[PDB]
Design an enzyme around this catalytic site. Structure first.
Site, mmCIF file in Angstrom:
data_model
loop_
_atom_site.group_PDB
_atom_site.id
_atom_site.type_symbol
_atom_site.label_atom_id
_atom_site.label_comp_id
_atom_site.label_asym_id
_atom_site.label_seq_id
_atom_site.Cartn_x
_atom_site.Cartn_y
_atom_site.Cartn_z
ATOM 1 N N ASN C 152 -4.419 10.020 31.074
ATOM 2 C CA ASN C 152 -5.255 9.436 32.149
ATOM 3 C C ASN C 152 -6.156 10.448 32.857
ATOM 4 O O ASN C 152 -7.309 10.108 33.200
ATOM 5 C CB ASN C 152 -4.389 8.667 33.179
ATOM 6 N N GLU C 251 6.792 13.919 35.878
ATOM 7 C CA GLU C 251 5.966 13.150 36.805
ATOM 8 C C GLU C 251 5.720 11.800 36.132
ATOM 9 O O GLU C 251 5.027 11.732 35.091
ATOM 10 C CB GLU C 251 4.672 13.898 37.131
ATOM 11 N N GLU C 464 6.375 20.264 41.637
ATOM 12 C CA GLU C 464 5.522 21.376 41.251
ATOM 13 C C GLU C 464 4.572 21.654 42.413
ATOM 14 O O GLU C 464 4.516 20.876 43.383
ATOM 15 C CB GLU C 464 4.791 21.077 39.929
#
Ligand SMILES: [Mg+2]
Ligand SMILES: [Mg+2]
Ligand SMILES: [Mg+2]
Ligand SMILES: [Mg+2]
Ligand SMILES: [Mg+2]
Ligand SMILES: [Mg+2]
Ligand SMILES: [Mg+2]
Ligand SMILES: [Mg+2]
Ligand SMILES: [Mg+2]
Ligand SMILES: [Mg+2]
Ligand SMILES: [Mg+2]
Ligand SMILES: [Mg+2]
Lengths: 484, 485, 484, 485
Positions: C152, C251, C464
């Site tokens: 994406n 994620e 992160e």
């Protein structure tokens, strides 16, 4: 050549001038302008205006970008900066390249990186009455920083204060030593060429007491004074800023010890003590003027250091073989030679040196002194207690660890110390006892710019380096917000 | 006779002259207080220095934290005595002495005990140009002997605010409380003695300031630092006095603090908050709001509501449970405040309420009472809105816009604290960030998280204390740099 | 054009290939090489060797200098990188310039600055038995990082993992999405042109399940896997690395809410929800697919968002007027259109959108879908609980604060949320209750790269950003030394 | 019958089947232990989830720290009972159970109480491209429900090492202690109950691991995290079990740890240290040194001195004050260890001392004793120097140089801990920095500062606990980003 002030974005000539003279051969290098109180006030006003004209509101990213442009600007003229520094100080060229100008440049990049990554503290408060608050700590500039910098490591110690002051969004009025005006004037030319907004950086030339330095310290509109130099001058400045309760940051004198245990690496420790005694002709606040050597190696240690000291070549920097330059001035040399006289009065054995050399040419018009080693003085003698700031060390025997720790700490100064040992436990347990701002083990004058640097007792006030610089050149505000 | 003695090297000791301790409620003599001369001050410093080397310097953080909790317990065990001493010296209403003074006094010791126990340090690796590698770590050791000169306004609270971090970091202490408020510090010495803190670690000297024990302490060449809370002029004197020795200094000095009330504020909360920030401790806190700025559409209503609450305060003696405001510290201080009250009137102020002393018709008139006072009508340039008065008074002015009031707040040679009242998210944060003070409260006042940096800007101070700032101030940092390759 | 693997310092062709097709018009952009298990193993071996050949021993200063060279290298080809990213994804050009490529570049500079300034913890221990120890915490690389990155935000999310992995001295084997190979292949060309040592960065192309991605996750010699993408795929990877107990950083998906209170700035909140629903055609894990609007402004809010959504221009990126591009693929579009079907089955009111547009030209061979708004579904409906990853939001009314907090937190996901209010107390007290990794107030997708970024519940594992990146891509060692 | 019950939602509850708790000293039955089935495990998780919302989630750090100190006090008040339970389950010599097990168990609660009380957070300002400004601050809230599966080797110590930070960060807990060592965890539940911790905040479930209560806990979809200390193989199983829910995990797993002794070491200290690191708790600590490398010039002398001290250990029952080493945990574990002892002999090991079980001639023979064992002569490739044995054994090999022994230490699929013995400054630091483990001790072993990061590399773990690492693991971090301009 005429060295001018730099005020509100332009170079400015002034009133009287004075000559810049070589410490190598006494030749005139330039005239230097002398700033009177009206001119100092001029600079302070330009800096205050530049604060309000938008410099106070730059972001940390904008400031870091400016710092990096300045650092690029110095690199582009690297050889000009080297030659200027060498001419002012007589420092050997190789040392001027790798210690002075390089670290000058690194100062800008270091504080540029630190203000880009820097963050702040957040605390939640749950009050007795059931209410809830958040706290966060913000930073804004002090405002205008007055910087008075010393002659011994001129560009290095100048940028060490200018870089963080600009990094935290302050404006600056900076007065370099009357003995070493040249590299600071070149730095102003860089500031000008990259287009730093006018009034953000101001350079004023002149002397100290009853002259530009004093005027700067007494101005009601400065926000703080940063100073590196003699402890007595630190005291004078502390009194001068008192009524305005200005911030102060001081890096002052020292009477530093080197300790060599019998278990040390002997040849590294002799080389190490040579370096820590005679680098920059002993004109570094970090230099070792007292040495304590464990008794079983004391005699061989003195003999070995004597040989290495006599192998140094004292002379002009254009000679590639030269390994020690002159003192900064014949006036400073008079003070050092007067201690050398006092050592004889106090009963010292002069192992080597003890006077000025004779060249038979224009170098005799300079300010040279020979590397000097003493033995035979008690801990109480003036020559092992008072800072000389010349190329000298006294060497004494010691018998045990608890004794030498006490003898090292027996001093009204507390800047730095170095310890030579191969033993793990000894190295750490002795270092943690030393009452200094810095302790090196098997090293000397290795400076990681993120670490806290400063002195204790007579040797200083505050720390610089890392977050200590971030906090000194800023006003901290705790913002406490009720949310429930 | 009650005689208040010095505490030096593990014992109470008198000296060769004394001065009276007088009540600010009715002027009666409470005690005689010994006065330390310069030879006795030097004795206390030398005892502190000997105690460093006798081993206090080598205590661990766990050992120190344990001492500090023992001290806290010892005060708690005598809580009502501490309260009564503090009330007798200051006239402070009893309920407030209990919860703000003595309770927070105890909390200072517990707080710094916990901070020192958990504190850690920094480690850095260096890869040098010549290929060698070094490790760096940062150690803290005590400065040595800390000289502590503390004010009369919140005596026990501000004394322990300095004594606790000093002891936590392994220093010895020579402490001189205000000549107006000797009693709770003397009880603290008794607690030090009863828990058996080693002789010389904590020393108490009584006396006056200028040309007296306070001054002598600051010029002593063997102290390591001076921490001082009080007038800015005295900070300047101290700064000169320690200059020859380049002593460390930490100062919390004067202020002329503002409270800002926007029209979008919670009105009832802001009126109560400004009552508090103006008249707490009879206006004798460095943090009090003596300037108030209120956005013009609610200005008249705000002045009227504050007037009504201020007139509902009950000024009197602390033994009356109905008293909600006590006297000033001394009749001399009252003279200074009443002289400002007269000056405000000459400068053209409108006296909304107060402006003078009450009249009781008994011995309370021999004390130092003055009424809560509110002014309006003075320009930003007037002496009465620029100079710190340190009494129960505020001036209120209208403002019209945000950029304007930020400028008016910052137009000051002081920069201690400020409070802002607004319900708007963006406004609260963007205004607070522009204020040139050490502290800014939003919809609050005098909320003190002891981990946060506390201090002033400009004339209002030097340095920060609180959390790591106290850890660093009361210690010498040493960077130990070890070659390993 | 053929997109090759990059292994041990050279580009390498391989076995079968597959076509890279435009999501705008279906045209063939290139062939892409497909890595089999032997080739994946090849890359892992090259990375392990490069560790031992000296990359493991670079200093933080050397690594930061490499990161900055790479960042310079991307800038020098900035337009090439933009065109590659646009061609793969159909993203509008203006957005590709300022969000994708710029932030790709900023990732390298950010972690370069962080590893230069980074320090460590030091603790002193005083043991019961009277002994004394020092502790310090050191970091060394994990070793070899396997990176599987999503389609994406291809360059951005790729460099977000590559930059810190290299910063901490790891070698990397990276497999970008089979849908978006192009900008990662250009990054390999930069790596090659600056001369990064061979095997330090390796790029392998191919598919996921039963293909290169899986092979990478099952290799016994990788040290960790970092992954951004679907939560189900996170679970599969977590099982695959289990026997080797490899480190993981995830994620994953989200079903994020936006909350608009009646006291919000109405026009900023409508614009804000337009952005958070339809940026990148709603294909951002951070997008808002649930919206809750306080009842008194609910009807006007729906109407205003409908108008602004219908004013978006859906189309090809070379049209300067285009403001939303296609979905990544016709296959992904089939999944999104199947949710759009399910919303009708569940009884939704379709305020706007609900299908694919018709162009009458080659754009119909692409993968476009219209911006879609629903109302009328209960909190329990599949279409307001399950992540769609298309340009859609459902909007519902709420009546009070405690209610909407509960409704926001009623989700098996917990990635992000945004809240619109002008009120100080409300803003803070509501934000602190939201069970997400990130909460914005009057903003959305503003990323300070120093802050901790990640998800809770099904949306992720770890953080992160800043020290969290420093600690994840490193092995921490506590060195505890007795000194007395 | 003593029946050891689960503790769920504020009460003790049995279940429908039980299993015996047997002594490792003489095999006698000590108690019956209830076994939790999957429906009961789910009950405990739902109680924990309800307790989050009933308000435990909203406690302040001060409130939590106070609960943790109350718990610590409650254990202290029953100190001798805790000692006797721990001794009965493990056979551990009494003096060691007192100072290493129960005392440190208490200290875990006090330590994390103090850390949470002082902990603070980060604040960042953002100046965005479009000119806007935002503030960021990082908040922590509990993960929710922590599932805790703890080992049999240091039962109370390692149970509280997880329970204390979990509760400190405001989580609820469902905890399953080892089926071998249920007793001290059950006493801990009684303390939880007696201090009145809210129902559902702390839940204890007893039972086995695989296809039993431990497994059920890890696959439960409503737990938020699993913290686990134990075998690496079991860590891998758990990692798969939580995968569908993407649960957080923290693992402290196996090791095959080395001790390195250089010829320049303090010889007597290094021999005593290696005795300790090899035979503490009968070699049943994850941190024990089962590989030893000694520089060749002192190798023979080192082996001989260690042999003499190892033969001076007294293996037996904890009621004898002369006992200095206890039994293994179970006869099953002893079977595994004695099978390695036989394997070492087949691989060509020289048995310097030990190698079998003692023979007592009474019921101690019905327990699980084995003798301290030292091997030499095996290559780095042998199974007995690569595979974790978790018994009282070490292999000793010679080495010749520094680069060599660093490689031999790091040649392992494990990377938990190591210890190095040297008096040389440069060597100590440069060797320690190359070792691929979570912890390296220099002239020490098993010194645990609870503020430092503790964990393993490679197969030995996932994540770090200790200090801020525990604060962050047992919390969800949220970055709150607020536009202000
Ligand atoms: Mg000169
Ligand atoms: Mg050598
Ligand atoms: Mg500051
Ligand atoms: Mg009085
Ligand atoms: Mg300071
Ligand atoms: Mg300090
Ligand atoms: Mg495609
Ligand atoms: Mg608007
Ligand atoms: Mg890590
Ligand atoms: Mg058993
Ligand atoms: Mg983790
Ligand atoms: Mg966490």
């Amino acid at each position: 050549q005429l060295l001018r002030h730099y005020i509100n974005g332009e170079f400015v000539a002034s009133g009287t001038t004075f000559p810049n003279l070589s410490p190598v051969d006494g030749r005139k290098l330039a005239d230097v302008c002398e700033a009177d109180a009206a001119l100092v006030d001029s600079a302070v006003q330009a800096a205050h205006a530049a604060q309000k004209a938008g410099w106070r509101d730059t972001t940390p990213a904008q400031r870091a970008a400016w710092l990096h442009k300045i650092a690029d600007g110095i690199e582009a003229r690297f050889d000009e900066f080297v030659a200027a520094e060498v001419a002012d100080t007589g420092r050997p060229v190789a040392q001027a390249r790798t210690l002075d100008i390089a670290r000058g440049i690194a100062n800008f990049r270091t504080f540029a990186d630190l203000v880009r990554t820097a963050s702040g503290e957040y605390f939640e408060t749950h009050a007795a009455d059931g209410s809830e608050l958040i706290n966060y700590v913000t930073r804004k500039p002090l405002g205008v920083i007055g910087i008075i910098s010393p002659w011994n490591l001129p560009l290095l110690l100048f940028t060490w204060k200018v870089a963080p002051a600009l990094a935290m969004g302050n404006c600056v009025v900076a007065k370099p030593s009357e003995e070493t005006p040249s590299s600071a004037t070149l730095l102003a030319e860089v500031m000008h060429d990259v287009g730093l907004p006018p009034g953000v950086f101001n350079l004023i030339h002149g002397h100290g007491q009853n002259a530009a330095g004093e005027f700067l310290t007494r101005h009601p509109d400065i926000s703080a004074i940063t100073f590196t130099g003699e402890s007595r001058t630190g005291s004078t400045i502390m009194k001068a800023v008192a009524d305005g309760v200005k911030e102060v940051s001081f890096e002052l004198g020292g009477k530093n010890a080197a300790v060599v245990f019998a278990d040390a690496d002997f040849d590294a420790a002799v080389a190490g003590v040579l370096r820590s005694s005679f680098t920059n002709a002993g004109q570094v606040c970090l230099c070792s003027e007292r040495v304590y050597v464990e008794r079983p190696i004391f005699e061989r240690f003195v003999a070995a250091l004597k040989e290495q000291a006599q192998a140094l070549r004292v002379g002009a920097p254009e000679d590639p073989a030269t390994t020690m330059g002159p003192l900064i001035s014949r006036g400073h040399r008079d003070k050092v030679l007067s201690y050398f006289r006092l050592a004889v009065e106090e009963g010292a054995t002069v192992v080597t040196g003890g006077g000025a050399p004779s060249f038979g040419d224009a170098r005799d018009d300079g300010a040279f002194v020979m590397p000097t080693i003493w033995t035979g003085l008690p801990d109480s003698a003036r020559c092992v207690r008072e800072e000389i700031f010349g190329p000298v060390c006294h060497i004494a025997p010691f018998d045990d660890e608890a004794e030498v720790v006490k003898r090292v700490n027996d001093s009204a100064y507390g800047l730095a110390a170095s310890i030579w040992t191969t033993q793990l436990a000894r190295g750490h347990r002795v270092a943690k006892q030393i009452e200094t701002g810095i302790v090196w083990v098997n090293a000397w004058f290795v400076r990681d710019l993120r670490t806290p640097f400063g002195g204790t007792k007579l040797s200083g006030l505050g720390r610089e380096g890392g977050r200590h610089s971030l906090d000194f050149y800023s006003e901290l505000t705790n913002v406490c917000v009720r949310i429930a």
